[PDB]
Amino acid sequence: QKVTRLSAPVALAYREVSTQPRVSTARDGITRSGSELITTLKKNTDTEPKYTTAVLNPSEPGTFNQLIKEAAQYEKYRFTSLRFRYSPMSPSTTGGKVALAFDRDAAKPPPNDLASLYNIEG
Amino acid sequence: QKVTRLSAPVALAYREVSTQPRVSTARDGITRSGSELITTLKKNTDTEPKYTTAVLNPSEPGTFNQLIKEAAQYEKYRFTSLRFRYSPMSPSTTGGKVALAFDRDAAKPPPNDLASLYNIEGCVSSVPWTGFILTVPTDSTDRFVADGISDPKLVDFGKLIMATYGQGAAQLGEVRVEYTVQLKNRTGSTSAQIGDFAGVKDGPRLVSWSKTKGTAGWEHDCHFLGTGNFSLTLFYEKAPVSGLENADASDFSVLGEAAAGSVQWAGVKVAERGQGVKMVTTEEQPKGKWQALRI
Amino acid sequence: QKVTRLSAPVALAYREVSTQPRVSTARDGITRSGSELITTLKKNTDTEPKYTTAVLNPSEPGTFNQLIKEAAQYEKYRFTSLRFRYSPMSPSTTGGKVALAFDRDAAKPPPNDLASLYNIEGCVSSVPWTGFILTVPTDSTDRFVADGISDPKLVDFGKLIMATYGQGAAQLGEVRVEYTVQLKNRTGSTSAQIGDFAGVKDGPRLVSWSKTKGTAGWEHDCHFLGTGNFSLTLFYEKAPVSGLENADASDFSVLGEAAAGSVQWAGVKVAERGQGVKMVTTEEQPKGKWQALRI
């Protein structure tokens, strides 16, 4: 049911911990699970977004500072699970948007403009 | 259980939709159900309320812009359901009150003062950061709508009221009218509104939207009871002073003389209920005629 | 069994009443049922028919004076039932025919000639001393009414027709329209009719009752498609020739200049469908504006 009643609190916030990691035989492979915190963002008190596009590959620290230490012994991968959460740690007395959607083709100019952004899955 | 714990949120708000309508055989009648949004209110950062009293009758648009189109074929009604909700769309960082209670006798001066208001049923004002409702004990007599004039008492229950007194800043909220009507006797006719003055008296005796008062020192009055863009068209004889001037108004269109015996026209675009326009011709009331179509 | 015996009475006649109306949920629509009496006919003591072709659309009063008041809140319809009866109220001591058959394509010249008529479905004319009915295969597409103008084909099925050719003397009879409509999509609005000319073209694009043709040698045309007493009000700029004259008309009320830039008004009281009134201003069409409310 959406309807009636809604509480946009002054403040909302979450409490995330500290992911401790998990792993498999030989078969011909190992495995992993997330827990990284990829850079933030910073205001934008402006009328055009502005992007931090960060690249994804088992070894690209600017996207993995704790797993780029166990790919110096292998070469090839997977992904089976991977999502990005906007933890939420800033009251509502603030607002705008925080676009956030990945594009397989992990390389090419972000646009310049929204619609452009607001047209690419994620 | 009231007790302990309460969350007066920064913000509260509701989500209302778009009432699509429902209806019955012959027996000797038809029916309806509400969905209107009767004008708002506007701050009041002051210490005395201030009222928008709006009148109730199957045909009084200033209280029904979607049902005053199916009473041009009948004459008489009902009411079985009708309540006004203060939708609630403005954070709590704002406050005061938003009085809102109906008085059968839908016509008589609002008071001037609260207690006065706070003594006439209705009951129910609350703060602006919450969602309230209002309800009315409806009767059961075959009353007639106004293909005029009459008397404001034998033709319609009574007007509604709404005040709000506060000072913390905002554009409070909005309301409508939850209802279900009975339109007996098959008739059919109407339009504008045409309202002539007869040297001794006038004549609004065929559906409203404006009341024509004058303020002595002749300078005059040409008003509204309804809200929207209109097509005036009208009145005449001794083309005096002026005519068709305007003040708490929306766009004006005059394509007349003055006239000293002429013809005239204008398009309004109003603002909130009751905005006014006026002529200028002497001293003491007789004139000519006019007709005000809504559009 | 036809055979043997037949009684063509001197007089035959019927007794019709006063249809009181019936209606449905939301689903996405409302409904209706007929009871109108669309203009008559008048002798024809001549050898070539002569037609009153009347147009069909939820809003075309010249074919609905009681239902063109509940299409100012919707846009689209149905038809599920609709037939025209020649009530029969005139003795047999009179005779001829009273053609009466509809043509989807509700717009195009009637012919000039019978066979022409007697070749277009509908079918069914009979003599004036009897009681006949007429029916129409109605479709099933969500068509839109005219908050104007358009095209007479994508907005309404087609006009109706009626001829009668005879010479023996009488005021034949009357008819209506047996129907049941579907008014989807919740809208709401309208009035008169306001219809402006733009130097290049015009503008009737907001509900009719008259068609404004001109006859060259400028002398002009100011017409009707509907029937009743009205309140004109309107149009202007180069106050020429005249204005507001009238010919196949009912009472006229002009309280204007001429105007060479003025304002004007009149009250009609018509006669049977399509009576005409006119101005007089030059040569070739551009002008000003007008609005025709029914009343």
Curated annotation (Swiss-Prot), chains B, C:
Spell out the residue ranges making up region: S domain, virion shell: 30-183
Source organism superkingdom: Viruses
Recorded GO CC terms? T=3 icosahedral viral capsid
> So what does mutating residue 156 to N actually do?
In strain: Infectious clone UK
Q: Which InterPro entries match?
A: Capsid_prot_S-dom_vir, Viral_coat
Localisation per UniProt entry: Virion
Q: Extract the PROSITE patterns matched here.
A: ICOSAH_VIR_COAT_S
Task: Give the co-factor note.
Answer: Binds Ca(2+). Ca(2+) probably promotes virus assembly and stabilize the virus particle.
Mutation effect (residue 287 to R): In strain: Infectious clone UK
* Pfam families for this protein: Viral_coat
Q: Assembly and interactions?
A: Homodimer. Homomultimer. Interacts (via GW motifs) with Arabidopsis thaliana AGO1 and AGO4; these interactions inhibit RNA silencing ability of host AGOs. Interacts with host TIP.
- Give a short account of what the protein does: Capsid protein self-assembles to form an icosahedral capsid with a T=3 symmetry, about 32-35 nm in diameter, and consisting of 180 capsid proteins. Also acts as a suppressor of RNA-mediated gene silencing known as post-transcriptional gene silencing (PTGS), a mechanism of plant viral defense that limits the accumulation of viral RNAs. May suppress other innate immunity by binding to host TIP protein, thereby preventing it to migrate in the nucleus where it could trigger an antiviral response.
The protein here is known as Capsid protein
